[PDB]
Structures are given as structure tokens and as C-alpha cells.
């Protein structure tokens, strides 16, 4: 679910 | 008398083997390299001067020429990667590290600055500065009982150079260098100068931009409460990196995210999600989307802090990039939330602004919204109230947009819309 | 900014 997508 | 010399005259003075002539010509080069417009960096490189400047860094008996050459080389290193490489190729890294111990504060400061430009070029020069041993002498300059006794400009330059040792990826900085710097960074993050605070936050934001283990090295030092405090600063140059660091941290484990919540961060989000700076709203909404990807008890704290109406607000009206983060925040929420939490979303007014964003010519936000609708319907099934939801979607023009998407080109999009129509609208 | 030029 987490997105390292700034 | 050293104003606007030609490069030719600089070369003639530097090649004279009269130390005082060399000093005057090196100051003339420094002034050229310091001018407002188009400093002639390539012409100075092409004249062959970097080796001479580097040898002048070593002239302990002529501190003025150490200073002038350090400033000249700093400004060459401030340029493109190729210009920084020319300085590194001349042997400047060990020569600057040796000047960190200078008894002249203005020379040590200039060496700090030059190494910041070198390390700031990229991961390889950063790691090469570290291998030549820069961290110990840099940290020794800050080993004072109270940072307030240092000159403000000097402390700002040190903080900035340390932030460049923390910057860049592929690879990230060596783990042992990060462990070595972090306690000094924690102390700088509590200092009262706004520029020191901003660059300390930037450094923390770089160190948390990475896998969970890098996040944990930072979070374990206990900085999250100070980051949340800075999240409420009035200076936008502090809020921006503080929020980037907080957002990086909540990309980590649910326990790391809980430390952000425990420190009070959610109480700042009413203002962040309405902030006049578009970039702050966007980063705040992205951060919210990684919090709504958490546990049901973390979703519940988002609810308790009154943040679902603020997400409805950003979905209704915001820059499109922010609206897209808001759509993600809603899909994450509906994917992880309880039935009661999802119901609450609808009572807050999520459906109409969600439907309105189906007019967007962005394929992934359409996929995101369709996923949310399906999740909301599934919660409605368990309550036996899908028809109430269908009518809601129909009254605000959403059914039209969903039907039209059956003829949308992306197969993932038309399959999702087909299922919705087949399942709940007939 | 990654790099800074000293102007004064």
C-alpha cells in the first residue's frame, strides 16, 4: 500500500 | 588593483615564482570567479591554473594565498560536474581536508564550503570525500558545548556541507558515515537559526529517503517530535524539508508511521492540506495517503483528527497533482478501512468529488478512483445498502462517467467499469 | 541547492 513516490 | 584582470595577466602573475605576485594574481582570479554574471570558469581551467591553486592551499606560511586559492577553487567546484571533477583531479580533496584544522577561521570555513561543493556533485565524489577522511575533522569543528558560540555564517556552512554528505542515492551514503554524522545532525536540528534548521531538515529528509532500515537509523535517534515541531514553523524553507522528512518516514513500517502520529503530526494537517503553497499541499496529501495505507487504528486517528473533510476538500479543489495524491489517499483508506470507517467517508461527501475526477484524462487516477468505488460498494454490500450508493452515484452524474468508461481504451479501466455497471447498476 | 558559488 505504501508508495515511495514523493 | 586586482579588479577585472585578464586570464592572461592572472597566468603571468601565478607563473612568476614571486609569492606576493602569485598572491595578487590569485586574488584577481578569485574576484573574476566571484563576479555576478558568467564567471569564466572554463577559461581558468583551460589556462592550467587548478594545480597551482591546489599547491597554494599548502602554503602554511602565506595564509592569504591559502584563503584566495581556497575561494577560487570553491567557485570552480561550484560549477558543472566536469568543472568539479577538474578540482578533484587536481588533488584538492586531501588539501582541503588538511585546511579544516587551520587556525584561521575564514580558511577552515572556505575549506568546509569547497568540500560541500565537491561532495554535493554526486554519490561518487561524496563517497570519495568520505574516504579521504573528511567526516572526523568536520565533526570536530562542531564539538563545542553550545553551538551558539560559533559564528552564524560558519555554522550554516558546516550544516550545509554535512547535508551534502547525507545527500544522493545509488548508492546512499555509507551506513557507518551516517551513524557517525547523525548525533551532530540531531544537535543541529535543535539549534535556533532558521537556515541551520532548514539544512538539518534537508539532511534528515535525504537520510529517510530510502528503505526501512535507513528510516529506522533516523527514527531511533528520537528526532520525530522535533521534526513535527518544525512542521509547524512559520518559515516555508523549514516546513518544506520537515514535511518531506515526515513523508519519507511514513513510507516505512507501520511502527515508524505510528511514531509520527504519536508525536502529534496529524494536528498540523488541517493547515498543511490548505496551505497556499501548492507543493506543501501536494506533499502533505501524499503523506496522508501513506498514513491511510496503515492500520485501521491509524486510519481511525486520521478520522479523529477531522482530516477526512480536508481530504474531501483537496479532492474537490486543488492542483491536479494534489488531487491525484488525494485519490490515492482515498483508495488506500477504502482498501484498509473498516466498514464503519468507509461509511464515514461517504457521509463526509467523498462521492461527488470522486465522480467529478473521472473526467480526468489521466489513466491511473481513473484506475485509482474505480478501485475506491468498488471498495466502497463492497462495504455497502455488507450493510445491504448498495442501492442507496448507486443512486448517490447516479444523482451526481457518476453513472454517466462510469458507463462512458466501458468504451475507454485501457482494458483495466473498461473491465473495472463493466464490473461496476454489471454488479450494482442493473 | 547542491552547489553554492561564493560571491562576496
Numbering used by the authors:
A (entry chain E): 1166 to 1171
B (entry chain B): 72 to 497
C (entry chain D): 1165 to 1172
What is the paper's account of this structure, in its own sentences?
As deadenylation represses translation and can trigger irreversible mRNA degradation, the GW182/TNRC6 protein family are essential scaffolds that link miRISCs to the decay machinery. Fluorescence microscopy analyses have demonstrated TNRC6 proteins also shuttle between nuclear and cytoplasmic compartments, consistent with the identification of a nuclear localisation signal (NLS) and nuclear export signal (NES) within the central region of TNRC6A. Impα acts as an adaptor that binds cNLS cargo on the surface of its armadillo (ARM) repeat domain, while interacting with transport-competent Impβ proteins through an N-terminal Impβ-binding (IBB) domain. cNLSs are short linear motifs, rich in basic amino acids. The inner surface of the Impα superhelix forms the cNLS binding groove, characterised by two binding regions termed the major and minor binding sites.
To gain molecular insights into TNRC6A localisation, we have determined the structure of Impα in complex with the TNRC6A cNLS. Orthorhombic crystals were obtained of mImpα1ΔIBB in complex with TNRC6A cNLS (residues 1164–1172 of the mouse protein corresponding to residues 1179–1187 of the human protein) isomorphous to previously determined mImpα1ΔIBB:cNLS structures. TNRC6A residues Gly1165-Arg1172 could be built unambiguously into strong difference density located at the mImpα1 major binding site. The peptide binds in an extended conformation, with basic side chains interacting with the Impα binding pockets. The TNRC6A cNLS binds to the Impα surface such that all 5 basic side chains are located at positions P1-P5 of the major binding site, highly similar to the SV40 TAg monopartite cNLS. In this binding register, TNRC6A Lys1167 (Lys1182 in hTNRC6A) is termed the critical P2 lysine forming a salt bridge with Asp192 of mImpα1. At the same time, Arg1168 in the P3 position forms a salt-bridge with Asp270 on the mImpα surface. More specifically, Arg1169 at the P4 pocket contacts the mImpα mainchain in the loop between ARM repeats 1 and 2 (Arg106-Glu107) that causes a shift in the Cα backbone when compared to cNLS bound structures that contain smaller residues, including lysine, at that position. The TNRC6A Arg1170 side chain is projected into the P5 cavity that is lined by Trp142 and Trp184, interacting with Gln181 at the end of the mImpα P5 pocket. At the minor binding-site, TNRC6A cNLS residues Lys1166-Glu1171 could be built into difference density maps located at mImpα1 ARM repeats 6–8.
